[PDB]
Amino acid sequence: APSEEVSVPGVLAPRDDVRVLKTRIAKLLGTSPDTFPGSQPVSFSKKHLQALKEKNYFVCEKSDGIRCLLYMTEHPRYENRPSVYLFDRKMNFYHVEKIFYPVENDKSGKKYHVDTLLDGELVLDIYPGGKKQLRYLVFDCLACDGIVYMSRLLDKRLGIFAKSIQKPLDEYTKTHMRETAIFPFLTSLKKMELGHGILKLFNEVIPRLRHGNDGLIFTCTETPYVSGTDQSLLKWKPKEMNTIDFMLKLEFAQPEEGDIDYSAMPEFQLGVWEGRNMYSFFAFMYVDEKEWEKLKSFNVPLSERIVECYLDDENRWRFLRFRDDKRDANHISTVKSVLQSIEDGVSKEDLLKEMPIIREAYYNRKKP
């Protein structure tokens, strides 16, 4: 019976704290306090294949987890108290107690970072023995130690973070084992390849990951950091990632004579939630005999329940897992949106075929 992660380590901060934080960040970056300063990517379409040939790009595995900005500052209440806050795109602030970030070449160990805004993702790695480890992967930096690098390019944005934050953290980590083992998570820089290193991610990086994955991310290294939707930031996903939740109904045809043989394969009808109580027939869920005997091996009710399905390479929906939590299937709007996402976007093949050209075009515009 297939069914079903990571969560923010901190605890929700009080309103009179998050308002002060919002104001402080707003004054630092020069944006609206309630407006999320982070960036959001766009769907990778065909027109981007040309884009990768006209600009320098960085590609990295798009891990699945919680995207949230990290903020090193002083506690809103107490005057001098080093504090770290994680906040998502919905502006929900979480105070991460029990964590610090060493300053470069700090003999005393009392120095701490302020006005430091990092852009990263929260993932959950699986180590040998089933032992889990929460991790924070940094892929950008909006501000560091009081300086706003949003006007700068990616190499400098990651460079300053590498020098003033990551390196002292590693230096501290390699000497202090037990101290590091108390951290709510391990902060590390995300492994990134060149825009044409796609293949390397497919055959080496991704299959050796310790956490989940859904597609790739292309980050332009020739563009400044942009709050909100970024045209240079591209999110690519193969067809199998676009999953839709349907209502499953097993239709056993009425036999010519005798009682219905349920051992025989029925029609797996998938329905979409339209109204509030009204569903509508959408498509069929393809199941072969091995998979059918597999379904009867669960010995659970199959009909009348939510299921998660994906489009295979043959453009037919296959069973993935049950959705015991979902009250209703995906609304017709969501279904339409996903169908549009599948209709658009570049295939893995047509994306790979363009790599040798992107590589040479990159080495061609290269600075001597």
Binding site: M278, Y279, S280, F281, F282
Partner: peptide, 4 residues
């Protein structure tokens, strides 16, 4: 037993 549904629409469409």
């Amino acid at each position: 037993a549904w629409n469409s």
